[PDB]
Design a protein around this ligand. Sequence first.
Ligand code: HEM
Length: 455
Amino acid sequence: TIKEMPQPKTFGELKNLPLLNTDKPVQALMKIADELGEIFKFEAPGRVTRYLSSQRLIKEACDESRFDKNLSQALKFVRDFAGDGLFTSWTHEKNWKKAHNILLPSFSQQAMKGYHAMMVDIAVQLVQKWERLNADEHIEVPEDMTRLTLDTIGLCGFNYRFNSFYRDQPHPFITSMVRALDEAMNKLQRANPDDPAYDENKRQFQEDIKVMNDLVDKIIADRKASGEQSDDLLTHMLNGKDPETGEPLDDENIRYQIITFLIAGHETTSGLLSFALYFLVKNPHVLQKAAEEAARVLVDPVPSYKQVKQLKYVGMVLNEALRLWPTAPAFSLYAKEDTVLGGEYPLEKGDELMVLIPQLHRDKTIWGDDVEEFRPERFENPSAIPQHAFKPFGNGQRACIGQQFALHEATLVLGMMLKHFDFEDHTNYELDIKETLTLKPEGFVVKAKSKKIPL
Ligand code: HEM
């Protein structure tokens, strides 16, 4: 069998590093994936990674007895401000298991009924903003969806109102957060700490962290001082105890959990809503089926939890957009012990594998030949889909805890947008995928004509 592992061109002691020295790394890796195939060795000075693009190989990588979540380099950087939150912890860290056991039931589909009203609040603010645009103004899709997701996570997370729909300049926290994330991403493509970065950046970085730590800390302190019982994630963490040690979460970890909900949930969820709208506006017939379902189900001024769950086709639209462009493009895994992958490629204990989600979703072997086409119908019968072929939310006990939250919000919002407006792609937008920790359609603009249905 073809057992030797290919590799892209190298640049001496710099190795393949220069290969991703671009503002669109994942998309570049996808090209390399097309050329080299379902697996290639990517080497850097003191780091080797193996990228997987096949369902054949990836279903083996998802075997939890052989592979576990690895903290990629980027995640290690993000750990400087996200600490030991669910997202940047090792599976073997005690605070990971603890937070995971306590928070698991609060993120179930059943628990969404408690967060529903808060999600509806921000969703109505979005509709009303659009309702009030003068007919000649347009919509900055990614920009509004991000305001929508940040405010929703803030309300549901710690009952705080960032009030993004009342300002051009975001709340200072949000600003320090995007800035810290930026720095963490730039550190990844740093030639070395002195090309680019110097004391000025690190200083700025440590500053943003204080702005974040200060706000969350204060809020935690104020709540346990007043003893308030709201329906947000913070209440659940203050009154929660792990069924295993009987221990509760510490105030520092609770802080990291909140910061983690923000950094891990806002861009991914905003990207999702933007892409779905993009494919819908580019595919008039799909938009027509969706719009019709929305008008048929959402027969009340404000959507009920029950009604959101009936938006069957809309859900299919979201899943198809998640197939084509998973907003969180990759996750890393490490070999627990030595093994051979796919019976061909030998792996040693500790070897890092990197799942290229966008490539996995284009596996002709699993999805057929029209993999590049946006066809929601392919998710009509989800049970007909092979195991580990569709992985937009990670794998196993380390999969996105916020999967239900994201999908419920995305469905609620998409449903409401399709009920109140007709969308016009007045600029004949050409997809431009901007990359940060996540993927998003940069510069996507549309124009919305209201159907004049009251809220
Ligand atoms: C549609 C949007 C979303 C996508 C595509 C997404 C994707 C993912 C992926 C791929 C991972 C695994 C990362 C890894 O294995 O290294 C993950 C983990 C996680 N996500 Fe999401 N996510 C989304 C929305 C959310 C939301 C709204 C929240 C926050 C409330 C959230 C919170 C988390 C957390 C905390 C983890 C870590 C779970 C653990 O390991 O214990 N995500 N997500």
